[PDB]
Write a protein that binds this ligand. Sequence first.
Ligand SMILES: [Cl-]
Ligand SMILES: [Cl-]
Length: 162
Amino acid sequence: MNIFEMLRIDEGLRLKIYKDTEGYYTIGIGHLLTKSPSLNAAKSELDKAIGRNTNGVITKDEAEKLFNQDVDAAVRGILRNAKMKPVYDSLDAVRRAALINMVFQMGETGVAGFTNSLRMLQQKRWDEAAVNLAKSRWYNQTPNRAKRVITTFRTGTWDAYK
Ligand SMILES: [Cl-]
Ligand SMILES: [Cl-]
């Protein structure tokens, strides 16, 4: 297991535009196109992301290509974030992937406000962090996925995904 398989499991793969759990237009492996309620807007952002007139449908290769860029982007966002980098650098490899998953889902922003959980993680106080992470909108809206990520931080293993 790795970050890619892990996220492909959390996000799924869809080749036509769809709405995510928050009602936003998305495509591929969790690639958010826009927060706008406009489908046209969405179709426009997609064609710009892909570089062709897609008509709201992409191929598998294209989806995987967006996915790689998004993963790369998430990592780099972490490395550039002063609040997050030190946490990330402090973690083992399995736990790093859990932090990337959260950023990929919620953005640097979103995560960068789990201040308290982040300190706990940096301290390697796993059970405590796991409890603090659950006190969130994130957990309450997507509990199953949140639990998988939270178990990963708690244990440092991939058991939740096997
Ligand atoms: Cl893009
Ligand atoms: Cl979920």
